[PDB]
Structures are given as structure tokens and as C-alpha cells.
Amino acid sequence: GSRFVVEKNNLKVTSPDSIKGIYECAIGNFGTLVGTVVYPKSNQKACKSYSDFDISFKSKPGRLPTFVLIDRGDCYFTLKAWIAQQAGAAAILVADSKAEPLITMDTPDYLQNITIPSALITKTLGDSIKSALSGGDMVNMKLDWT
Ligand SMILES: [Cl-]
């Protein structure tokens, strides 16, 4: 089957209240955690090393782990997950570039070494998160890989 499996009650936005709720996502097969979402200002498709930009997603001690929001395009989803993992992300969310069913997004080497949770999300949810972040809101999220 597909390497990303659609799940109905596995992603919960916990803050801000404007977008709080439960949303569908497609969880990667390779691969509960609460994290804070960041949308990088560069290399937004995660097809090149974040270290070339001097960008790190490792959280400070005592702070929420960082979930990186990544745009679909230009490279395979597994490479995006590997690259965010090397940058210290605790998980990755890849937002679709088109408005369409999630199951359509996952179309037909280091894959055995990906260890962070990975999920695909819709364009609508990606845009909502980006809007919340752009306004100054912290976006917190709970992933459940059950
Ligand atoms: Cl695989």
C-alpha cells in the first residue's frame, strides 16, 4: 500500500483557539507527542540541508519539541523527513500544494533511518497554521500514532 496512511483522529491542534480542533492526517509508515509548529522562512520544501541556511529546529531544554511545517514539492516526502530530522525537528508535517483528498497526495536508502513522526496534511490546514503563525500566534499540536 501507500507509505502514508490516512487517519481520522490522530492530529489535534491545541492552540490557538481560532484553529483548535482535530484534523485528518496521513502518517508515514517508516517512523503521542506534543510540539509547537514552526514554518521556516527559507528552504520551505526541505529538499536541501537546513544546515546550509544555519537553521536548526532543536528545542531548548524545557521547551516544546519543534514540529516543522513543510510544503509539498520538488523532492520525495521521505527526503523531506530525513532533512528535517538532520535539522533537529521532532516531527514533520507536509502540507499539500493543492486542495484535494489526503489519500490522493501520497501517489505511487536512508528510508530505514528515519525516526521522527511524519504526517501529510491538507492545504487548508497548512494555510490555517501559516495564518495563525503569521499573526503572532503560537501553534501547538498533539500527534497520536496509535
Ligand atoms: Cl517504505
UniProtKB/Swiss-Prot annotation:
Family recorded in the similarity comment: Belongs to the VSR (BP-80) family.
Lineage top rank: taxon: Eukaryota
Localization (cell): Membrane; Golgi apparatus membrane; Cytoplasmic vesicle, Clathrin-coated vesicle membrane; Prevacuolar compartment membrane
Start and end residues of each PA domain: 32-133
Protein name: Vacuolar-sorting receptor 1
Glycan attachment sites: 113
Job of this protein: Vacuolar-sorting receptor (VSR) involved in clathrin-coated vesicles sorting from Golgi apparatus to vacuoles. Required for the sorting of 12S globulin, 2S albumin and maybe other seed storage proteins to protein storage vacuoles (PSVs) in seeds. May also be implicated in targeting N-terminal propeptide containing proteins to lytic vacuoles.
Free-text note on domains in this protein's UniProt record: The tyrosine-based internalization signal may be involved in trafficking at the trans Golgi network (TGN).
Part of the intact protein present: 20 to 176 of 623
Expression sites (tissue/organ): Mostly expressed in roots and dividing cells (at protein level). Also expressed in seeds, seedlings, leaves, stems, flowers, siliques and pollen.
Quaternary state and interactors: Interacts with the N-terminal propeptide of ALEU and the C-terminal part of the 12S globulin CRA1 in a calcium-dependent manner. Binds to EPSIN1.
Induction info: Slightly induced by water deficit.
